[PDB]
Coordinates of C-alpha atoms in Angstrom, one line a residue:
Chain A
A1 CA 0.0 0.0 0.0
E2 CA 1.0 3.7 -0.5
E3 CA 0.1 6.6 1.7
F4 CA -0.3 8.8 -1.3
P5 CA -1.2 8.2 -5.0
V6 CA 1.9 7.9 -7.3
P7 CA 1.8 9.8 -10.6
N8 CA 1.7 7.8 -13.8
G9 CA 5.2 7.0 -15.0
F10 CA 6.7 7.3 -11.5
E11 CA 7.8 4.6 -9.1
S12 CA 7.6 4.4 -5.3
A13 CA 10.8 2.7 -4.0
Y14 CA 13.3 2.6 -1.1
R15 CA 17.0 2.8 -0.6
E16 CA 19.1 2.2 2.5
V17 CA 21.3 5.1 3.4
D18 CA 23.6 4.7 6.3
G19 CA 21.4 1.9 7.7
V20 CA 18.2 3.9 7.3
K21 CA 15.5 2.9 4.8
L22 CA 14.4 6.0 2.9
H23 CA 11.2 6.1 0.8
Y24 CA 11.1 8.2 -2.4
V25 CA 9.1 8.6 -5.6
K26 CA 11.1 8.8 -8.8
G27 CA 10.5 9.4 -12.5
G28 CA 11.8 11.0 -15.6
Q29 CA 15.1 11.1 -17.5
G30 CA 18.0 13.5 -17.6
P31 CA 20.0 15.3 -14.9
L32 CA 18.7 14.8 -11.3
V33 CA 16.5 17.1 -9.4
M34 CA 15.7 16.3 -5.7
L35 CA 12.6 17.8 -4.2
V36 CA 12.4 17.9 -0.4
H37 CA 9.2 18.5 1.5
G38 CA 8.6 19.9 5.0
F39 CA 6.5 19.6 8.1
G40 CA 2.9 18.4 7.9
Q41 CA 3.6 16.9 4.5
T42 CA 5.5 14.3 2.5
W43 CA 6.8 13.8 -1.0
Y44 CA 3.2 14.2 -2.2
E45 CA 3.3 18.0 -1.9
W46 CA 5.4 17.8 -5.1
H47 CA 3.0 15.5 -7.1
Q48 CA 1.8 18.3 -9.4
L49 CA 5.3 19.6 -10.2
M50 CA 6.8 16.1 -10.7
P51 CA 5.3 15.1 -14.0
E52 CA 6.1 18.5 -15.6
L53 CA 9.6 18.5 -14.3
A54 CA 10.1 14.8 -15.4
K55 CA 9.8 15.9 -19.0
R56 CA 13.4 17.4 -18.7
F57 CA 14.9 15.8 -15.6
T58 CA 15.1 12.7 -13.5
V59 CA 13.0 13.7 -10.5
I60 CA 13.3 12.2 -7.0
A61 CA 11.1 13.2 -4.1
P62 CA 12.1 11.5 -0.8
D63 CA 10.2 11.3 2.5
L64 CA 12.2 13.0 5.2
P65 CA 13.6 10.5 7.8
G66 CA 10.8 9.4 10.1
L67 CA 8.1 11.1 8.0
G68 CA 5.9 9.6 5.2
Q69 CA 7.2 6.1 4.6
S70 CA 10.9 6.7 5.6
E71 CA 12.5 5.1 8.6
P72 CA 13.6 7.5 11.4
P73 CA 17.2 8.7 11.4
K74 CA 19.7 6.7 13.4
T75 CA 22.0 9.6 14.1
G76 CA 19.7 12.5 14.9
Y77 CA 17.3 15.2 13.6
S78 CA 19.7 18.2 13.5
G79 CA 20.1 19.8 10.0
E80 CA 23.7 18.5 9.6
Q81 CA 22.7 14.9 10.6
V82 CA 19.6 14.7 8.3
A83 CA 21.4 16.4 5.4
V84 CA 23.9 13.5 5.3
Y85 CA 21.0 11.1 4.4
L86 CA 19.6 13.3 1.7
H87 CA 23.0 14.1 0.2
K88 CA 23.9 10.4 0.1
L89 CA 20.5 9.4 -1.3
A90 CA 20.9 12.0 -4.2
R91 CA 24.4 10.8 -4.9
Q92 CA 23.3 7.2 -5.3
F93 CA 21.3 8.5 -8.3
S94 CA 23.6 11.2 -9.5
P95 CA 27.2 10.0 -8.7
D96 CA 28.9 11.6 -11.7
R97 CA 27.1 15.0 -12.1
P98 CA 25.9 17.7 -9.8
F99 CA 22.2 17.7 -9.1
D100 CA 19.5 20.3 -8.6
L101 CA 17.8 20.8 -5.2
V102 CA 14.4 22.2 -4.5
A103 CA 13.3 22.5 -0.8
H104 CA 10.3 23.8 1.1
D105 CA 9.7 24.4 4.8
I106 CA 11.9 22.2 7.0
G107 CA 13.3 20.7 3.8
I108 CA 15.5 23.8 3.9
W109 CA 16.7 23.0 7.4
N110 CA 17.5 19.4 6.4
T111 CA 19.4 20.3 3.2
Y112 CA 21.3 23.6 3.8
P113 CA 24.3 21.9 5.5
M114 CA 24.9 19.4 2.7
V115 CA 24.5 22.2 0.1
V116 CA 27.2 24.4 1.8
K117 CA 29.5 21.5 2.4
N118 CA 29.2 19.9 -1.0
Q119 CA 28.8 22.8 -3.3
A120 CA 30.4 21.0 -6.3
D121 CA 27.5 18.5 -6.0
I122 CA 24.8 21.1 -6.4
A123 CA 24.1 22.6 -9.8
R124 CA 21.1 24.9 -9.0
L125 CA 19.2 25.6 -5.8
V126 CA 15.6 26.6 -5.1
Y127 CA 14.5 27.4 -1.6
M128 CA 11.0 28.3 -0.6
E129 CA 9.0 29.3 2.4
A130 CA 11.2 28.8 5.5
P131 CA 14.1 30.5 7.2
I132 CA 17.5 28.8 7.1
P133 CA 18.0 28.2 10.8
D134 CA 20.0 31.2 12.2
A135 CA 19.6 34.0 14.7
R136 CA 16.9 35.6 12.6
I137 CA 14.4 33.1 13.9
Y138 CA 14.6 34.5 17.4
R139 CA 13.1 37.8 16.1
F140 CA 9.7 36.4 15.1
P141 CA 7.0 37.4 17.6
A142 CA 5.1 35.2 20.0
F143 CA 1.8 37.0 19.3
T144 CA 0.3 39.6 17.0
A145 CA -2.4 42.3 17.1
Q146 CA -4.4 40.2 14.8
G147 CA -4.1 36.9 16.7
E148 CA -1.8 33.9 16.5
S149 CA 1.7 34.5 15.1
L150 CA 3.4 32.6 12.3
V151 CA 5.9 30.6 14.3
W152 CA 4.7 30.1 17.9
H153 CA 4.7 26.4 17.0
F154 CA 8.5 26.4 17.1
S155 CA 8.1 26.6 20.9
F156 CA 5.1 24.2 21.0
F157 CA 6.9 21.6 19.0
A158 CA 10.3 22.0 20.7
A159 CA 8.8 21.8 24.2
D160 CA 9.8 18.8 26.3
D161 CA 7.6 16.2 28.1
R162 CA 6.4 15.2 24.6
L163 CA 4.1 18.2 24.9
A164 CA 3.1 18.2 21.2
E165 CA 2.7 14.4 20.8
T166 CA 0.7 14.2 23.9
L167 CA -1.8 16.9 23.1
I168 CA -2.0 16.2 19.3
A169 CA -2.4 12.4 19.5
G170 CA -6.0 11.5 18.8
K171 CA -6.5 14.9 17.3
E172 CA -4.0 14.8 14.4
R173 CA -6.5 15.6 11.6
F174 CA -8.0 18.5 13.7
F175 CA -4.6 20.0 14.5
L176 CA -3.2 19.7 11.0
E177 CA -6.2 21.3 9.4
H178 CA -5.9 24.3 11.7
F179 CA -2.1 24.5 11.2
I180 CA -2.2 24.3 7.4
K181 CA -5.1 26.7 7.1
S182 CA -3.6 29.2 9.5
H183 CA -0.6 29.4 7.3
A184 CA -2.5 29.5 4.0
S185 CA -4.0 32.2 1.9
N186 CA -5.8 29.7 -0.4
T187 CA -7.5 27.4 2.0
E188 CA -9.7 25.9 -0.6
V189 CA -6.9 23.9 -2.2
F190 CA -6.9 21.8 1.0
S191 CA -9.8 19.5 0.4
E192 CA -11.0 17.4 3.3
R193 CA -9.7 14.4 1.4
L194 CA -6.1 15.9 1.1
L195 CA -6.1 16.7 4.8
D196 CA -7.2 13.2 5.6
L197 CA -4.2 11.8 3.6
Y198 CA -1.6 14.0 5.3
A199 CA -3.1 13.5 8.7
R200 CA -3.1 9.7 8.5
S201 CA 0.6 9.8 7.5
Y202 CA 1.9 12.0 10.3
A203 CA -0.4 10.3 12.8
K204 CA 1.8 7.2 12.8
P205 CA 3.3 7.3 16.3
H206 CA 6.9 7.3 15.0
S207 CA 6.1 10.0 12.4
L208 CA 4.3 12.2 15.0
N209 CA 7.4 12.1 17.2
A210 CA 9.8 12.5 14.2
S211 CA 7.9 15.7 13.2
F212 CA 8.6 17.4 16.5
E213 CA 12.1 16.1 16.9
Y214 CA 13.1 18.3 13.9
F215 CA 12.0 21.3 16.1
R216 CA 13.7 19.9 19.2
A217 CA 16.9 20.0 17.2
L218 CA 16.3 23.5 15.8
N219 CA 18.6 25.4 18.3
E220 CA 21.3 22.8 17.6
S221 CA 20.8 23.4 13.9
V222 CA 21.1 27.2 14.4
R223 CA 24.4 26.6 16.2
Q224 CA 25.7 24.3 13.5
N225 CA 24.8 26.8 10.8
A226 CA 26.6 29.6 12.6
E227 CA 29.8 27.8 11.7
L228 CA 28.7 26.5 8.2
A229 CA 27.6 30.0 7.1
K230 CA 31.3 31.2 7.1
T231 CA 31.3 29.7 3.6
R232 CA 28.9 31.5 1.2
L233 CA 26.8 29.6 -1.4
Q234 CA 28.2 30.0 -4.9
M235 CA 25.6 28.2 -7.1
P236 CA 22.7 29.8 -8.9
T237 CA 19.9 30.1 -6.4
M238 CA 16.2 31.1 -6.5
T239 CA 14.0 31.8 -3.6
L240 CA 10.2 31.8 -3.6
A241 CA 7.8 33.1 -0.9
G242 CA 4.1 33.7 -0.5
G243 CA 3.0 37.3 -0.4
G244 CA -0.3 36.5 1.2
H245 CA -1.5 35.5 4.6
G246 CA 0.7 32.8 6.1
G247 CA 3.7 33.6 3.8
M248 CA 7.2 34.8 4.5
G249 CA 7.1 37.7 2.0
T250 CA 10.4 39.5 1.5
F251 CA 12.1 37.6 4.4
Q252 CA 13.0 34.7 2.2
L253 CA 15.1 36.6 -0.4
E254 CA 16.5 39.1 2.2
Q255 CA 17.9 36.2 4.3
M256 CA 19.2 34.3 1.3
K257 CA 21.1 37.4 0.2
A258 CA 23.2 36.9 3.3
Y259 CA 24.0 33.3 2.3
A260 CA 24.2 33.3 -1.5
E261 CA 26.3 35.3 -4.0
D262 CA 24.0 34.6 -7.0
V263 CA 20.3 34.7 -6.0
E264 CA 17.1 35.9 -7.5
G265 CA 13.8 35.9 -5.6
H266 CA 10.1 36.1 -6.2
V267 CA 7.2 36.8 -3.9
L268 CA 3.9 35.4 -5.1
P269 CA 0.9 37.6 -4.4
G270 CA -2.3 35.8 -3.2
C271 CA -0.3 32.8 -1.9
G272 CA 0.6 31.7 1.6
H273 CA 3.1 29.2 3.0
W274 CA 2.0 26.1 1.0
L275 CA 3.2 27.2 -2.4
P276 CA 3.1 23.9 -4.3
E277 CA -0.6 23.5 -3.4
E278 CA -1.8 27.1 -3.0
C279 CA -0.1 28.4 -6.1
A280 CA 0.9 25.3 -8.2
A281 CA 0.8 26.9 -11.6
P282 CA 3.0 29.9 -11.1
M283 CA 5.3 28.1 -8.6
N284 CA 5.8 25.2 -11.1
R285 CA 6.5 27.6 -13.9
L286 CA 9.1 29.6 -12.0
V287 CA 10.9 26.4 -10.8
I288 CA 10.8 24.7 -14.2
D289 CA 12.1 27.8 -16.0
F290 CA 14.8 28.5 -13.4
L291 CA 16.1 24.9 -13.6
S292 CA 15.8 24.8 -17.4
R293 CA 18.4 27.6 -17.8
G294 CA 20.8 24.7 -17.1
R295 CA 21.3 21.7 -19.4
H296 CA 18.5 19.1 -19.3
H297 CA 16.7 16.4 -21.4
Chain B
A1 CA -18.2 21.7 48.3
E2 CA -14.7 23.3 48.1
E3 CA -12.1 22.9 45.5
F4 CA -9.3 24.0 47.8
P5 CA -9.0 24.0 51.6
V6 CA -9.8 27.3 53.4
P7 CA -7.2 28.6 55.9
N8 CA -8.3 28.5 59.6
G9 CA -10.5 31.4 60.4
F10 CA -11.4 32.2 56.8
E11 CA -14.7 31.7 55.1
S12 CA -15.6 30.6 51.6
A13 CA -18.6 32.5 50.3
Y14 CA -20.2 34.0 47.1
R15 CA -21.4 37.4 46.0
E16 CA -23.6 38.1 43.0
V17 CA -22.2 41.0 41.1
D18 CA -23.9 42.3 38.0
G19 CA -25.7 38.9 37.7
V20 CA -22.5 36.8 38.0
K21 CA -21.9 34.7 41.1
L22 CA -18.3 35.3 42.3
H23 CA -16.6 32.9 44.7
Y24 CA -14.2 34.3 47.2
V25 CA -12.3 33.5 50.4
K26 CA -12.3 36.1 53.2
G27 CA -10.8 36.6 56.6
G28 CA -9.3 39.2 59.0
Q29 CA -10.1 42.6 60.2
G30 CA -9.1 46.1 59.2
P31 CA -8.7 47.9 55.9
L32 CA -9.5 45.8 52.8
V33 CA -6.9 44.1 50.6
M34 CA -8.0 42.2 47.6
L35 CA -5.7 39.4 46.2
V36 CA -6.3 38.5 42.5
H37 CA -4.9 35.2 41.1
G38 CA -3.8 34.4 37.5
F39 CA -3.9 31.7 34.8
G40 CA -3.7 28.1 35.8
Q41 CA -4.6 28.9 39.4
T42 CA -7.4 30.2 41.7
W43 CA -7.6 32.1 45.0
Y44 CA -5.6 29.3 46.5
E45 CA -2.3 30.6 45.3
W46 CA -2.6 33.2 48.1
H47 CA -3.4 30.8 50.9
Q48 CA 0.0 31.1 52.6
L49 CA 0.0 34.9 52.4
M50 CA -3.6 35.3 53.5
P51 CA -3.3 34.4 57.3
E52 CA -0.3 36.8 57.6
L53 CA -2.1 39.7 56.0
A54 CA -5.3 38.9 58.0
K55 CA -3.5 40.0 61.2
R56 CA -3.7 43.6 60.0
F57 CA -6.2 43.6 57.1
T58 CA -9.5 42.3 56.0
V59 CA -8.4 40.0 53.2
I60 CA -10.5 38.9 50.2
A61 CA -9.3 36.5 47.4
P62 CA -11.8 36.0 44.6
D63 CA -11.8 33.5 41.9
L64 CA -11.7 35.2 38.5
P65 CA -15.0 34.9 36.4
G66 CA -15.3 31.4 35.0
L67 CA -12.3 30.1 37.0
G68 CA -12.3 28.4 40.4
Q69 CA -15.8 28.5 41.7
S70 CA -16.9 31.7 40.0
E71 CA -19.4 31.9 37.2
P72 CA -18.3 33.1 33.8
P73 CA -18.7 36.8 33.0
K74 CA -21.9 37.9 31.3
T75 CA -20.3 40.8 29.5
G76 CA -17.0 39.5 28.3
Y77 CA -13.4 38.6 29.1
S78 CA -11.6 41.8 28.2
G79 CA -9.7 43.6 31.0
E80 CA -12.2 46.5 31.2
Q81 CA -15.2 44.1 31.4
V82 CA -13.8 41.8 34.0
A83 CA -12.4 44.7 36.1
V84 CA -16.0 46.0 36.7
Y85 CA -16.8 42.7 38.5
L86 CA -13.7 42.9 40.7
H87 CA -14.1 46.6 41.5
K88 CA -17.7 46.2 42.5
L89 CA -16.9 43.1 44.6
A90 CA -14.2 45.0 46.5
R91 CA -16.4 48.0 47.0
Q92 CA -19.2 45.9 48.6
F93 CA -16.8 45.2 51.4
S94 CA -15.1 48.6 51.4
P95 CA -17.7 51.1 50.3
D96 CA -16.4 54.1 52.2
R97 CA -12.6 53.6 52.1
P98 CA -10.0 52.9 49.5
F99 CA -8.7 49.3 49.5
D100 CA -5.3 47.7 48.6
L101 CA -4.8 45.5 45.6
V102 CA -2.4 42.6 44.9
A103 CA -2.6 40.9 41.5
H104 CA -0.6 38.2 39.8
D105 CA -0.5 37.3 36.1
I106 CA -3.8 37.8 34.3
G107 CA -5.1 39.3 37.6
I108 CA -3.2 42.3 36.4
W109 CA -5.1 42.3 33.0
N110 CA -8.3 42.0 34.9
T111 CA -7.7 44.9 37.4
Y112 CA -5.6 47.6 35.6
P113 CA -8.7 49.3 34.0
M114 CA -10.5 49.6 37.3
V115 CA -7.4 51.0 39.0
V116 CA -6.9 53.7 36.4
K117 CA -10.6 54.5 36.3
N118 CA -11.1 54.6 40.0
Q119 CA -7.7 55.8 41.4
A120 CA -9.2 57.2 44.6
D121 CA -10.5 53.7 45.5
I122 CA -7.0 52.1 45.4
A123 CA -4.8 53.0 48.4
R124 CA -1.7 50.9 47.4
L125 CA -1.0 48.5 44.5
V126 CA 1.2 45.4 44.1
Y127 CA 1.5 43.9 40.6
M128 CA 3.5 40.7 39.9
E129 CA 4.5 38.5 37.0
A130 CA 2.8 39.6 33.8
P131 CA 2.8 42.4 31.3
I132 CA 0.0 45.0 31.5
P133 CA -1.6 44.5 28.1
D134 CA -0.1 46.9 25.6
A135 CA 2.0 47.0 22.5
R136 CA 5.0 45.6 24.4
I137 CA 3.3 42.2 24.3
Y138 CA 3.9 42.0 20.5
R139 CA 7.7 42.3 21.1
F140 CA 8.1 39.0 23.0
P141 CA 9.7 36.2 20.8
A142 CA 8.0 33.1 19.6
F143 CA 11.2 31.0 20.2
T144 CA 14.5 31.5 22.1
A145 CA 18.0 30.2 21.9
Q146 CA 17.2 28.2 25.0
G147 CA 13.9 26.7 23.8
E148 CA 10.2 27.6 24.4
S149 CA 9.6 31.3 25.0
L150 CA 7.8 32.9 27.9
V151 CA 4.6 33.8 26.1
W152 CA 4.2 31.6 22.9
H153 CA 1.1 30.3 24.6
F154 CA -0.6 33.7 24.0
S155 CA -1.0 32.5 20.4
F156 CA -1.9 28.9 21.3
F157 CA -4.7 30.1 23.7
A158 CA -5.9 32.8 21.4
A159 CA -6.1 30.7 18.3
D160 CA -9.5 30.2 16.5
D161 CA -11.5 27.0 16.3
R162 CA -11.1 26.3 20.0
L163 CA -7.6 24.9 19.2
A164 CA -6.4 24.9 22.8
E165 CA -9.5 23.5 24.4
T166 CA -9.8 20.8 21.8
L167 CA -6.2 19.6 22.3
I168 CA -6.1 20.0 26.1
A169 CA -9.5 18.5 27.0
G170 CA -8.9 15.1 28.6
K171 CA -5.2 16.1 29.2
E172 CA -5.6 19.0 31.6
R173 CA -3.6 17.6 34.4
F174 CA -0.7 16.7 32.1
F175 CA -0.8 20.1 30.4
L176 CA -1.0 22.1 33.6
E177 CA 2.0 20.3 35.1
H178 CA 4.1 21.1 32.0
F179 CA 2.9 24.7 31.8
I180 CA 3.5 25.4 35.5
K181 CA 6.9 23.7 35.7
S182 CA 8.1 25.2 32.4
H183 CA 7.5 28.7 34.0
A184 CA 9.2 27.8 37.3
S185 CA 12.7 28.0 38.8
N186 CA 11.8 26.2 42.0
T187 CA 9.7 23.4 40.4
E188 CA 9.8 21.3 43.5
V189 CA 7.0 23.2 45.2
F190 CA 4.6 21.8 42.7
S191 CA 3.9 18.5 44.3
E192 CA 1.7 16.0 42.5
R193 CA -0.9 16.6 45.2
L194 CA -0.9 20.4 44.6
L195 CA -1.1 20.0 40.8
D196 CA -4.0 17.6 41.2
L197 CA -5.9 20.3 43.1
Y198 CA -5.3 23.0 40.5
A199 CA -5.9 20.7 37.5
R200 CA -9.2 19.4 38.9
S201 CA -10.4 23.0 39.0
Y202 CA -9.4 24.3 35.6
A203 CA -10.5 21.0 34.0
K204 CA -14.2 21.9 34.5
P205 CA -15.2 22.4 30.9
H206 CA -16.5 26.0 31.5
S207 CA -13.2 26.8 33.3
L208 CA -11.0 25.4 30.6
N209 CA -12.9 27.5 28.1
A210 CA -12.9 30.6 30.4
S211 CA -9.1 30.3 30.9
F212 CA -8.6 30.7 27.2
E213 CA -11.2 33.4 26.7
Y214 CA -9.0 35.8 28.7
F215 CA -6.3 35.3 26.0
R216 CA -8.8 35.6 23.2
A217 CA -9.7 39.0 24.6
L218 CA -6.1 40.1 25.0
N219 CA -5.9 42.2 21.8
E220 CA -9.1 43.9 22.9
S221 CA -7.6 44.6 26.3
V222 CA -4.5 46.1 24.5
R223 CA -6.8 48.4 22.6
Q224 CA -8.7 49.4 25.7
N225 CA -5.5 50.1 27.6
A226 CA -4.1 52.4 24.9
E227 CA -6.8 54.9 25.8
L228 CA -6.6 54.3 29.6
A229 CA -2.8 54.7 29.8
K230 CA -3.1 58.4 28.9
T231 CA -3.5 58.9 32.7
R232 CA -0.6 57.7 34.9
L233 CA -1.3 55.9 38.2
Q234 CA -0.7 58.1 41.2
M235 CA -0.9 55.7 44.2
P236 CA 2.1 53.9 45.8
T237 CA 2.9 50.8 43.6
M238 CA 5.3 47.9 43.9
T239 CA 6.2 45.4 41.2
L240 CA 7.6 41.9 41.8
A241 CA 9.0 39.6 39.2
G242 CA 11.0 36.3 39.2
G243 CA 14.7 36.5 38.2
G244 CA 14.9 32.7 37.6
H245 CA 13.7 30.5 34.9
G246 CA 10.2 31.4 33.7
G247 CA 10.1 34.8 35.3
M248 CA 9.6 38.3 33.8
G249 CA 12.8 39.7 35.2
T250 CA 13.5 43.4 34.7
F251 CA 10.5 43.8 32.3
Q252 CA 8.0 44.1 35.1
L253 CA 9.4 47.2 36.6
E254 CA 10.5 48.8 33.3
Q255 CA 7.0 48.6 31.9
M256 CA 5.4 49.8 35.1
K257 CA 7.5 52.9 35.1
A258 CA 5.6 54.0 32.1
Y259 CA 2.3 53.5 34.0
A260 CA 3.0 54.8 37.5
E261 CA 4.5 57.9 39.1
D262 CA 5.4 56.1 42.4
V263 CA 6.8 52.6 41.8
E264 CA 9.4 50.4 43.4
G265 CA 10.4 47.1 41.9
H266 CA 12.0 43.9 43.0
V267 CA 13.3 40.9 41.0
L268 CA 13.5 37.8 43.2
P269 CA 16.5 35.6 42.4
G270 CA 16.0 31.8 42.0
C271 CA 12.2 32.3 41.5
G272 CA 10.2 32.0 38.3
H273 CA 6.6 32.9 37.5
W274 CA 4.8 31.4 40.5
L275 CA 6.1 33.7 43.2
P276 CA 3.7 32.9 46.1
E277 CA 4.6 29.2 45.9
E278 CA 8.2 29.2 44.6
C279 CA 9.4 31.9 46.9
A280 CA 6.8 32.4 49.7
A281 CA 9.1 33.8 52.4
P282 CA 10.6 36.7 50.5
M283 CA 7.5 37.4 48.5
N284 CA 5.2 37.5 51.5
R285 CA 7.6 39.7 53.3
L286 CA 7.9 42.2 50.5
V287 CA 4.1 42.4 50.2
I288 CA 3.3 42.6 53.9
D289 CA 6.0 45.3 54.4
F290 CA 4.8 47.3 51.5
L291 CA 1.1 47.3 52.5
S292 CA 1.9 48.0 56.1
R293 CA 3.4 51.4 55.2
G294 CA -0.3 52.5 54.9
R295 CA -3.1 52.1 57.5
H296 CA -3.5 48.6 58.8

């Protein structure tokens, strides 16, 4: 069985990486592009981009360790530890050529270290809708004059006593709908059915815990990145952010300018945090065009 | 039926105020002092301080509307609305004389408006361990380099769709122990027995909801206070804050200086948010001494 429907022409498969069984969905021919999802989701957030991209590229979309159908990491959930798994997975499929990387949400946290440490392996980079973990995250407010803030969940999820698992278990679908919609401009794209699929995946006990372990490692990731960021990113980079309710707006590009020498950015009006679903058509277009400036099938 | 044990010589009683039945515990003789509790607790947080104050004052400690054994408010949960109930309650017992006020946590939110609107009714004021609702609350961080921040729960509790009640229902005792301890320096005072008492009270469905309605009204309270703060408080004031894990530190006094002409402040080392319980001896001493400067 599969947690999410696989697009025609794609295969669902697994590879062992450093003793951890990773799930991914793969299709297409040409140079490799790896797409990395974030919290609340799985490889499936990429399912609309995948067929289009596969016309020019070999496309792989893994489940993050512990999430979707991937085994939890055996090292840890800090950015540097998780990035090893994703880097090695990509290199199994693209051993002789650099590959492209597209990441969303905590996919950024879990890839930045392998990007900065293996720059010759990364042809082009697309980052959307999440801060790279650094001191900037400590500036986001706990509360706003309009109600709940964007990232109060960093504290909820990082809290000890398994606070998040204990409160959310048995209410996974309820919580995820609130969380997704509170970070969305276009809530209509999240059908009850789509929410059911995502909720059932992250409700698996080991996946519910894995979800929050990424946040419990966030401060460690910030400390790791403080050292890593001494080396600037040199590859062509594009940032995308939502300009609507729930989005990061200008923050995405402004932060990335501190990290990357060669970066262009777009803010998408009328779109929140969940770009691949809320604004599939323009997001897909911008990603396909940016990656197609390089050689492809 | 009592949720918490009354100190010897005190009485547990109720007063109907503007159609809302308020529970309070009362004892002592002399000028009136009203003690107002905060989130996660009830009048009981004051039970160690009460007998000491009762030697010089008439002491009343009400349960906030909807919490403890008090009915929910009929108007609403904003500071200005709730303050009417507390002001009227105090004035039933002290109709001809100003009274003293001691407030902790959301007790501050629920009393500030009646203090500024009825300054002549308030002889001396002690505020501890929470911001007065104003624009300063939007400057607290969601996340810190140590972990969970002081007030991320403002967003959790204020969130739409009854997010907090829905998640916490059936898990009130677990949640309260985490919330209290995460805001404490001296966690050891929160015995399983004491936590059982507080949890049983706020787990009443209407009390769980009431708890969060105070946070849902927070932005309204901020808007209310923007107008009220145009007049500075003139009566003697003291602020207390914890200097240890979970405490407000220097923020308490610094904010209060913008609100009050006459203010002295203390930060208690090794103490977090829950001053009456974590640091009873020094906190009680500071409060008793400050109030005993006036008539008692």
